PDB file of C-alpha atoms and ligand atoms in Angstrom:
ATOM      1  CA  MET A   1    -171.194  85.284  30.219  1.00 12.79           C
ATOM      2  CA  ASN A   2    -171.620  83.215  27.032  1.00 12.97           C
ATOM      3  CA  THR A   3    -172.365  83.488  23.144  1.00 10.96           C
ATOM      4  CA  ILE A   4    -175.970  84.295  23.892  1.00 13.40           C
ATOM      5  CA  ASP A   5    -174.837  86.841  26.556  1.00 12.22           C
ATOM      6  CA  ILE A   6    -173.137  89.055  23.194  1.00 10.40           C
ATOM      7  CA  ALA A   7    -175.294  88.042  20.341  1.00 12.43           C
ATOM      8  CA  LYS A   8    -178.364  89.524  23.085  1.00 10.78           C
ATOM      9  CA  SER A   9    -174.861  92.696  22.920  1.00 14.45           C
ATOM     10  CA  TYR A  10    -174.761  92.506  19.186  1.00 13.97           C
ATOM     11  CA  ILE A  11    -178.345  91.837  18.418  1.00 12.23           C
ATOM     12  CA  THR A  12    -179.212  95.095  20.980  1.00 13.42           C
ATOM     13  CA  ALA A  13    -176.722  97.414  19.407  1.00 12.49           C
ATOM     14  CA  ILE A  14    -177.522  97.508  15.651  1.00 12.11           C
ATOM     15  CA  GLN A  15    -181.248  97.363  17.194  1.00  8.84           C
ATOM     16  CA  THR A  16    -180.152 100.982  18.985  1.00  6.17           C
ATOM     17  CA  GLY A  17    -177.498 101.610  16.504  1.00 10.33           C
ATOM     18  CA  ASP A  18    -174.849 101.237  19.042  1.00  6.77           C
ATOM     19  CA  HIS A  19    -171.997 102.032  16.846  1.00  5.90           C
ATOM     20  CA  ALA A  20    -169.600 101.807  19.390  1.00  2.16           C
ATOM     21  CA  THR A  21    -170.490  98.775  20.738  1.00  2.49           C
ATOM     22  CA  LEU A  22    -170.590  96.831  17.254  1.00  2.00           C
ATOM     23  CA  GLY A  23    -166.500  97.815  16.787  1.00  2.00           C
ATOM     24  CA  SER A  24    -165.453  95.977  19.694  1.00  2.31           C
ATOM     25  CA  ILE A  25    -167.831  93.490  20.601  1.00  2.43           C
ATOM     26  CA  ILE A  26    -167.091  92.054  16.396  1.00  3.05           C
ATOM     27  CA  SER A  27    -163.787  91.304  15.533  1.00  4.15           C
ATOM     28  CA  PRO A  28    -161.043  92.540  14.123  1.00  3.21           C
ATOM     29  CA  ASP A  29    -160.992  89.704  11.970  1.00  3.35           C
ATOM     30  CA  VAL A  30    -164.462  89.520  11.689  1.00  7.23           C
ATOM     31  CA  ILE A  31    -164.876  86.501   8.404  1.00  2.98           C
ATOM     32  CA  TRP A  32    -168.653  89.039   7.859  1.00  4.19           C
ATOM     33  CA  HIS A  33    -170.776  86.283   5.205  1.00  5.71           C
ATOM     34  CA  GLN A  34    -173.689  88.543   3.430  1.00  9.85           C
ATOM     35  CA  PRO A  35    -175.678  86.000   0.635  1.00  8.40           C
ATOM     36  CA  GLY A  36    -177.431  86.849  -2.126  1.00  7.63           C
ATOM     37  CA  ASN A  37    -176.306  89.489  -5.938  1.00  5.17           C
ATOM     38  CA  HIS A  38    -176.582  92.170  -4.404  1.00  6.05           C
ATOM     39  CA  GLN A  39    -173.989  95.131  -3.899  1.00  3.44           C
ATOM     40  CA  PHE A  40    -172.904  93.837  -0.945  1.00  2.42           C
ATOM     41  CA  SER A  41    -173.001  90.169  -1.279  1.00  2.00           C
ATOM     42  CA  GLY A  42    -170.103  87.980  -1.284  1.00  2.00           C
ATOM     43  CA  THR A  43    -167.835  87.720   1.794  1.00  2.00           C
ATOM     44  CA  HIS A  44    -166.314  90.259   3.806  1.00  2.00           C
ATOM     45  CA  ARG A  45    -163.138  90.226   6.063  1.00  2.00           C
ATOM     46  CA  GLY A  46    -162.080  91.704   8.379  1.00  2.00           C
ATOM     47  CA  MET A  47    -164.014  95.311  10.375  1.00  2.00           C
ATOM     48  CA  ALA A  48    -160.756  97.110   7.998  1.00  2.00           C
ATOM     49  CA  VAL A  49    -163.504  96.084   5.174  1.00  2.00           C
ATOM     50  CA  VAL A  50    -166.838  95.452   7.263  1.00  2.00           C
ATOM     51  CA  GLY A  51    -166.986  98.484   9.262  1.00  2.00           C
ATOM     52  CA  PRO A  52    -167.301 100.650   5.875  1.00  2.00           C
ATOM     53  CA  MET A  53    -169.892  98.227   3.975  1.00  2.00           C
ATOM     54  CA  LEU A  54    -171.542  98.313   6.576  1.00  2.00           C
ATOM     55  CA  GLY A  55    -171.902 102.127   6.946  1.00  2.00           C
ATOM     56  CA  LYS A  56    -172.669 101.816   2.988  1.00  2.00           C
ATOM     57  CA  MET A  57    -174.938  99.519   3.945  1.00  2.00           C
ATOM     58  CA  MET A  58    -176.611 102.139   6.129  1.00  2.00           C
ATOM     59  CA  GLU A  59    -176.620 104.914   3.856  1.00  2.00           C
ATOM     60  CA  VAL A  60    -178.419 102.640   1.116  1.00  2.00           C
ATOM     61  CA  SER A  61    -181.396 101.624   2.714  1.00  2.20           C
ATOM     62  CA  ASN A  62    -181.470 105.481   4.506  1.00  2.00           C
ATOM     63  CA  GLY A  63    -181.177 104.330   7.260  1.00  2.00           C
ATOM     64  CA  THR A  64    -184.076 102.207   7.781  1.00  2.00           C
ATOM     65  CA  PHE A  65    -182.663  98.147   7.529  1.00  2.00           C
ATOM     66  CA  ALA A  66    -183.590  97.116  11.197  1.00  2.00           C
ATOM     67  CA  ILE A  67    -183.390  93.412  12.403  1.00  2.00           C
ATOM     68  CA  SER A  68    -187.487  94.910  13.425  1.00  2.00           C
ATOM     69  CA  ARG A  69    -188.488  91.609  15.574  1.00  2.00           C
ATOM     70  CA  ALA A  70    -185.436  89.161  17.950  1.00  2.00           C
ATOM     71  CA  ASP A  71    -186.859  85.646  18.191  1.00  2.00           C
ATOM     72  CA  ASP A  72    -185.299  83.250  19.199  1.00  2.00           C
ATOM     73  CA  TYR A  73    -181.680  83.066  20.651  1.00  2.00           C
ATOM     74  CA  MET A  74    -179.288  79.407  20.255  1.00  2.00           C
ATOM     75  CA  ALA A  75    -176.764  77.662  21.032  1.00  2.00           C
ATOM     76  CA  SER A  76    -174.768  75.485  19.174  1.00  2.00           C
ATOM     77  CA  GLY A  77    -170.888  74.933  20.068  1.00  2.00           C
ATOM     78  CA  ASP A  78    -169.234  78.492  19.496  1.00  2.00           C
ATOM     79  CA  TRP A  79    -172.353  79.035  17.051  1.00  2.00           C
ATOM     80  CA  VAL A  80    -175.119  81.603  18.194  1.00  2.00           C
ATOM     81  CA  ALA A  81    -178.441  81.037  15.952  1.00  2.00           C
ATOM     82  CA  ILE A  82    -180.549  83.877  15.780  1.00  2.00           C
ATOM     83  CA  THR A  83    -184.812  83.900  14.729  1.00  2.00           C
ATOM     84  CA  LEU A  84    -185.172  87.302  13.693  1.00  2.00           C
ATOM     85  CA  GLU A  85    -187.313  89.242  11.456  1.00  3.24           C
ATOM     86  CA  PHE A  86    -186.159  92.611   8.940  1.00  5.23           C
ATOM     87  CA  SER A  87    -186.991  95.051   7.001  1.00  4.05           C
ATOM     88  CA  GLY A  88    -186.215  98.845   5.153  1.00  5.49           C
ATOM     89  CA  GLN A  89    -187.382 100.272   2.886  1.00  5.45           C
ATOM     90  CA  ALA A  90    -185.046 101.472   0.471  1.00  4.28           C
ATOM     91  CA  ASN A  91    -184.649 101.729  -3.300  1.00  2.29           C
ATOM     92  CA  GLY A  92    -188.856 101.224  -3.845  1.00  2.00           C
ATOM     93  CA  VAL A  93    -188.131  98.047  -2.107  1.00  2.00           C
ATOM     94  CA  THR A  94    -190.804  97.807   1.065  1.00  2.00           C
ATOM     95  CA  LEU A  95    -188.010  94.740   2.976  1.00  2.00           C
ATOM     96  CA  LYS A  96    -189.922  92.818   5.899  1.00  2.00           C
ATOM     97  CA  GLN A  97    -189.364  88.915   5.774  1.00  2.00           C
ATOM     98  CA  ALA A  98    -188.249  87.019   8.315  1.00  2.00           C
ATOM     99  CA  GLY A  99    -183.680  85.801   8.804  1.00  2.00           C
ATOM    100  CA  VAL A 100    -181.649  84.289  10.606  1.00  2.00           C
ATOM    101  CA  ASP A 101    -178.267  84.932  12.172  1.00  2.00           C
ATOM    102  CA  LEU A 102    -175.463  82.709  13.266  1.00  2.00           C
ATOM    103  CA  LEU A 103    -172.666  84.370  15.478  1.00  2.00           C
ATOM    104  CA  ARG A 104    -169.367  82.483  15.474  1.00  2.00           C
ATOM    105  CA  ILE A 105    -168.735  83.249  18.795  1.00  2.00           C
ATOM    106  CA  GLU A 106    -165.026  83.087  20.489  1.00  2.00           C
ATOM    107  CA  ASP A 107    -162.914  84.622  23.584  1.00  2.00           C
ATOM    108  CA  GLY A 108    -166.419  88.041  23.622  1.00  2.00           C
ATOM    109  CA  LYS A 109    -166.323  88.189  20.225  1.00  2.00           C
ATOM    110  CA  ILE A 110    -167.369  87.306  17.256  1.00  2.00           C
ATOM    111  CA  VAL A 111    -165.761  85.996  14.929  1.00  2.00           C
ATOM    112  CA  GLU A 112    -167.751  85.156  11.946  1.00  2.00           C
ATOM    113  CA  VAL A 113    -170.793  86.181  10.913  1.00  2.00           C
ATOM    114  CA  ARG A 114    -173.156  84.289   8.360  1.00  2.00           C
ATOM    115  CA  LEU A 115    -176.951  85.660   7.408  1.00  2.00           C
ATOM    116  CA  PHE A 116    -179.888  84.331   5.918  1.00  2.00           C
ATOM    117  CA  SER A 117    -182.691  85.607   4.668  1.00  2.00           C
ATOM    118  CA  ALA A 118    -186.406  83.523   3.457  1.00  2.00           C
ATOM    119  CA  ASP A 119    -186.944  86.470   1.024  1.00  2.00           C
ATOM    120  CA  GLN A 120    -183.716  86.031  -1.023  1.00  2.00           C
ATOM    121  CA  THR A 121    -185.302  87.234  -4.129  1.00  2.00           C
ATOM    122  CA  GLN A 122    -186.494  90.637  -2.324  1.00  2.00           C
ATOM    123  CA  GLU A 123    -183.835  91.402  -0.575  1.00  2.00           C
ATOM    124  CA  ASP A 124    -180.662  91.793  -3.169  1.00  2.00           C
ATOM    125  CA  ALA A 125    -184.123  94.257  -4.708  1.00  2.00           C
ATOM    126  CA  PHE A 126    -183.774  96.100  -1.531  1.00  2.00           C
ATOM    127  CA  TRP A 127    -180.279  96.278  -1.538  1.00  2.00           C
ATOM    128  CA  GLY A 128    -179.428  96.879  -5.286  1.00  2.00           C
ATOM    129  CA  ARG A 129    -176.134  97.100  -7.958  1.00  2.00           C
TER     130      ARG A 129
ATOM    131  CA  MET B   1    -182.826  70.947  -8.163  1.00  2.00           C
ATOM    132  CA  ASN B   2    -180.312  73.300  -5.527  1.00  2.00           C
ATOM    133  CA  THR B   3    -179.419  73.004  -2.033  1.00  2.00           C
ATOM    134  CA  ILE B   4    -182.901  74.047  -0.650  1.00  2.00           C
ATOM    135  CA  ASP B   5    -184.339  71.621  -2.995  1.00  2.00           C
ATOM    136  CA  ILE B   6    -182.271  69.074  -1.288  1.00  2.00           C
ATOM    137  CA  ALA B   7    -183.041  70.329   2.613  1.00  2.00           C
ATOM    138  CA  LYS B   8    -186.743  69.787   1.326  1.00  2.00           C
ATOM    139  CA  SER B   9    -185.890  66.759   1.028  1.00  2.00           C
ATOM    140  CA  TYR B  10    -184.847  65.800   3.468  1.00  2.00           C
ATOM    141  CA  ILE B  11    -186.977  67.361   6.296  1.00  2.00           C
ATOM    142  CA  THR B  12    -190.251  65.765   4.382  1.00  2.00           C
ATOM    143  CA  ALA B  13    -188.803  62.470   4.136  1.00  2.00           C
ATOM    144  CA  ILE B  14    -187.828  62.972   8.427  1.00  2.00           C
ATOM    145  CA  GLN B  15    -190.785  63.839   8.450  1.00  2.00           C
ATOM    146  CA  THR B  16    -192.500  60.855   6.703  1.00  2.00           C
ATOM    147  CA  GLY B  17    -190.152  58.198   7.988  1.00  2.00           C
ATOM    148  CA  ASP B  18    -188.502  57.850   4.408  1.00  2.00           C
ATOM    149  CA  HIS B  19    -185.131  56.135   6.194  1.00  2.00           C
ATOM    150  CA  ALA B  20    -184.979  55.230   2.075  1.00  2.00           C
ATOM    151  CA  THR B  21    -184.528  58.518   0.508  1.00  2.00           C
ATOM    152  CA  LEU B  22    -182.414  59.957   4.542  1.00  2.00           C
ATOM    153  CA  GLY B  23    -179.810  56.799   3.913  1.00  2.00           C
ATOM    154  CA  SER B  24    -179.154  58.673   0.432  1.00  2.00           C
ATOM    155  CA  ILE B  25    -179.459  62.223   0.342  1.00  2.00           C
ATOM    156  CA  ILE B  26    -177.657  62.400   3.837  1.00  5.95           C
ATOM    157  CA  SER B  27    -173.543  62.010   3.240  1.00  8.79           C
ATOM    158  CA  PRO B  28    -171.455  58.664   4.124  1.00  9.08           C
ATOM    159  CA  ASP B  29    -169.010  60.306   5.978  1.00  6.14           C
ATOM    160  CA  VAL B  30    -171.633  63.393   7.700  1.00  4.48           C
ATOM    161  CA  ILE B  31    -170.790  66.283   9.978  1.00  2.71           C
ATOM    162  CA  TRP B  32    -173.507  65.584  12.449  1.00  4.99           C
ATOM    163  CA  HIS B  33    -173.703  68.614  16.016  1.00  2.81           C
ATOM    164  CA  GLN B  34    -175.943  67.703  18.583  1.00  3.05           C
ATOM    165  CA  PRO B  35    -176.163  70.796  20.934  1.00  2.00           C
ATOM    166  CA  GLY B  36    -176.863  70.051  24.411  1.00  2.00           C
ATOM    167  CA  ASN B  37    -175.636  68.022  27.562  1.00  2.00           C
ATOM    168  CA  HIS B  38    -177.197  65.224  26.639  1.00  3.51           C
ATOM    169  CA  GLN B  39    -176.850  60.369  25.528  1.00  4.26           C
ATOM    170  CA  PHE B  40    -176.118  62.337  22.013  1.00  6.57           C
ATOM    171  CA  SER B  41    -174.967  65.644  22.390  1.00  4.52           C
ATOM    172  CA  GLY B  42    -171.477  66.586  20.754  1.00  6.11           C
ATOM    173  CA  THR B  43    -169.844  66.180  16.603  1.00  7.06           C
ATOM    174  CA  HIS B  44    -170.905  62.457  15.590  1.00  9.28           C
ATOM    175  CA  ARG B  45    -169.252  61.564  11.562  1.00 13.60           C
ATOM    176  CA  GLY B  46    -170.027  58.951   9.410  1.00 13.56           C
ATOM    177  CA  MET B  47    -173.168  56.992   8.290  1.00 12.41           C
ATOM    178  CA  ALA B  48    -171.488  53.818  10.257  1.00 11.35           C
ATOM    179  CA  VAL B  49    -172.363  56.266  13.637  1.00 12.88           C
ATOM    180  CA  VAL B  50    -174.993  59.029  12.924  1.00 10.79           C
ATOM    181  CA  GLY B  51    -177.618  55.829  11.148  1.00 10.96           C
ATOM    182  CA  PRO B  52    -177.820  54.243  14.344  1.00 12.29           C
ATOM    183  CA  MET B  53    -177.970  57.283  16.562  1.00  7.85           C
ATOM    184  CA  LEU B  54    -180.760  58.684  15.222  1.00  7.21           C
ATOM    185  CA  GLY B  55    -182.334  54.785  15.575  1.00  7.50           C
ATOM    186  CA  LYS B  56    -181.116  55.102  19.138  1.00  7.97           C
ATOM    187  CA  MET B  57    -183.216  58.685  19.315  1.00  9.80           C
ATOM    188  CA  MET B  58    -186.555  57.017  18.153  1.00 10.49           C
ATOM    189  CA  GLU B  59    -185.959  54.751  20.051  1.00  7.06           C
ATOM    190  CA  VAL B  60    -186.119  56.165  23.060  1.00  7.98           C
ATOM    191  CA  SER B  61    -188.510  59.017  22.662  1.00  3.90           C
ATOM    192  CA  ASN B  62    -190.713  55.515  21.782  1.00  5.21           C
ATOM    193  CA  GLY B  63    -190.835  57.725  17.852  1.00  5.97           C
ATOM    194  CA  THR B  64    -192.721  60.590  19.184  1.00  2.74           C
ATOM    195  CA  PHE B  65    -189.408  62.836  19.003  1.00  2.70           C
ATOM    196  CA  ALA B  66    -191.219  65.270  14.798  1.00  4.09           C
ATOM    197  CA  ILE B  67    -190.102  68.052  13.426  1.00  4.03           C
ATOM    198  CA  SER B  68    -193.900  69.316  13.711  1.00  6.80           C
ATOM    199  CA  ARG B  69    -193.805  72.815  11.837  1.00  9.09           C
ATOM    200  CA  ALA B  70    -191.242  73.775   8.925  1.00 12.49           C
ATOM    201  CA  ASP B  71    -191.148  77.195   8.400  1.00 14.25           C
ATOM    202  CA  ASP B  72    -188.154  79.015   6.418  1.00 14.86           C
ATOM    203  CA  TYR B  73    -185.661  77.476   4.258  1.00 15.19           C
ATOM    204  CA  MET B  74    -182.871  79.567   3.314  1.00 15.98           C
ATOM    205  CA  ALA B  75    -180.307  78.722   1.963  1.00 12.54           C
ATOM    206  CA  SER B  76    -176.307  80.665   1.823  1.00 15.60           C
ATOM    207  CA  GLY B  77    -172.819  80.572   0.105  1.00 16.10           C
ATOM    208  CA  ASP B  78    -173.967  75.738   0.150  1.00 19.49           C
ATOM    209  CA  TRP B  79    -175.146  76.180   3.227  1.00 20.71           C
ATOM    210  CA  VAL B  80    -179.626  75.832   3.916  1.00 22.92           C
ATOM    211  CA  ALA B  81    -181.258  76.833   7.877  1.00 25.18           C
ATOM    212  CA  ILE B  82    -184.172  75.615   8.634  1.00 23.61           C
ATOM    213  CA  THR B  83    -186.696  77.244  11.376  1.00 26.64           C
ATOM    214  CA  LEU B  84    -188.858  74.711  12.627  1.00 24.39           C
ATOM    215  CA  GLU B  85    -190.142  73.016  15.559  1.00 25.22           C
ATOM    216  CA  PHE B  86    -189.691  69.903  16.982  1.00 22.73           C
ATOM    217  CA  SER B  87    -192.207  68.443  19.536  1.00 22.98           C
ATOM    218  CA  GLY B  88    -192.817  65.269  21.208  1.00 27.32           C
ATOM    219  CA  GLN B  89    -193.228  63.233  24.473  1.00 29.80           C
ATOM    220  CA  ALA B  90    -190.765  60.908  26.378  1.00 29.27           C
ATOM    221  CA  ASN B  91    -188.678  59.793  29.700  1.00 28.62           C
ATOM    222  CA  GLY B  92    -191.483  62.627  31.228  1.00 29.30           C
ATOM    223  CA  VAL B  93    -190.905  65.029  28.920  1.00 28.88           C
ATOM    224  CA  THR B  94    -193.549  67.231  27.025  1.00 29.27           C
ATOM    225  CA  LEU B  95    -190.667  68.833  24.305  1.00 28.06           C
ATOM    226  CA  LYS B  96    -192.037  71.536  21.961  1.00 28.31           C
ATOM    227  CA  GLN B  97    -190.565  74.504  20.910  1.00 28.42           C
ATOM    228  CA  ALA B  98    -188.666  76.115  17.763  1.00 29.48           C
ATOM    229  CA  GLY B  99    -184.949  74.646  16.122  1.00 31.48           C
ATOM    230  CA  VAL B 100    -182.823  75.334  13.606  1.00 29.15           C
ATOM    231  CA  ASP B 101    -180.995  72.890  11.327  1.00 24.79           C
ATOM    232  CA  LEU B 102    -178.145  74.117   9.339  1.00 27.66           C
ATOM    233  CA  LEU B 103    -177.912  71.914   6.882  1.00 27.40           C
ATOM    234  CA  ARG B 104    -174.464  71.888   4.614  1.00 25.31           C
ATOM    235  CA  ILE B 105    -174.750  70.038   0.854  1.00 24.82           C
ATOM    236  CA  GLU B 106    -173.144  70.045  -1.532  1.00 25.76           C
ATOM    237  CA  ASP B 107    -172.699  68.098  -5.183  1.00 26.09           C
ATOM    238  CA  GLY B 108    -176.731  66.391  -3.894  1.00 23.08           C
ATOM    239  CA  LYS B 109    -175.301  65.502  -0.286  1.00 25.44           C
ATOM    240  CA  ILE B 110    -176.483  66.391   2.983  1.00 24.92           C
ATOM    241  CA  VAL B 111    -172.537  66.636   3.216  1.00 24.27           C
ATOM    242  CA  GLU B 112    -172.445  68.441   7.749  1.00 22.09           C
ATOM    243  CA  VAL B 113    -175.698  69.116  10.198  1.00 21.34           C
ATOM    244  CA  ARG B 114    -175.369  71.486  13.368  1.00 20.83           C
ATOM    245  CA  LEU B 115    -178.864  71.290  15.146  1.00 23.55           C
ATOM    246  CA  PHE B 116    -180.408  74.267  17.503  1.00 27.10           C
ATOM    247  CA  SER B 117    -183.357  73.818  19.880  1.00 27.14           C
ATOM    248  CA  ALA B 118    -184.775  77.318  21.584  1.00 27.30           C
ATOM    249  CA  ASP B 119    -184.785  75.283  24.950  1.00 26.58           C
ATOM    250  CA  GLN B 120    -181.884  72.816  25.005  1.00 26.41           C
ATOM    251  CA  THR B 121    -182.707  71.712  28.888  1.00 24.66           C
ATOM    252  CA  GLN B 122    -185.967  70.660  27.987  1.00 26.94           C
ATOM    253  CA  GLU B 123    -184.797  68.610  25.255  1.00 28.30           C
ATOM    254  CA  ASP B 124    -181.541  67.587  27.522  1.00 28.95           C
ATOM    255  CA  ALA B 125    -183.748  66.886  29.723  1.00 32.46           C
ATOM    256  CA  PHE B 126    -186.101  64.262  26.773  1.00 31.65           C
ATOM    257  CA  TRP B 127    -183.747  63.122  25.231  1.00 30.64           C
ATOM    258  CA  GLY B 128    -181.906  62.035  28.719  1.00 29.51           C
ATOM    259  CA  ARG B 129    -178.578  60.068  30.209  1.00 31.79           C
TER     260      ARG B 129
HETATM  261 CL1   CL C 201    -186.792  93.206  19.492  1.00 32.65          CL
HETATM  262 CL1   CL C 202    -187.967 103.709  -0.284  1.00 33.28          CL
HETATM  263 CL1   CL C 203    -194.422  71.160   7.612  1.00 33.98          CL
HETATM  264 CL1   CL C 204    -193.641  60.340  28.588  1.00 36.58          CL
END
């Protein structure tokens, strides 16, 4: 079992809303870097913070924020880049754009997450203040 | 002038073979992570090493290794992810595949590079041993 397997499990769990997997395969000490200039932007540390933030995100997006398509999983050292599309409809914003999730995986767990968006102005409006 | 501007300058310079730009906008102390299992794979530090390695790469690929298409430039903290396609024809291998370049940019310079390839088996064969 390799880092791409773990990354695929992570994406499948996001896509299918499997909180059990997400709560288990993400490190309790996860460092999560969310880009941009909206209420969830910044670096967050620990599932104590990240779990509730993911929940608030689901609330703010009326459950519509989604990785609508995953394209490629690529490994480099302990990192995996996943190229993808995400979408959503909330705060009057129709979100549809390319992104990349960067995951750092160690000992079977995602220890660091850095997200990238192709249109950060649109994503910022989506999440809101 | 922002990190995406620097990333675009970097990609344009690779694409047009502008060694002057590359030699100037890449940090002398650049940390360069090349994935896979071929003769250039591993982490390399310093332009004293990276410059000559880029030259050897051009030689090994008969000057054909190319970023054939750049798709999106995305910023997250001091990192920029560039989704792209690369191609080449060398060592009996026709290379054509998606990739992502991750650049860390500080004070106007690229200080760290991490490359990702969609088909590392094919890229490994391309570069060879
Ligand atoms: Cl998908
Ligand atoms: Cl809406
Ligand atoms: Cl292009
Ligand atoms: Cl050939």
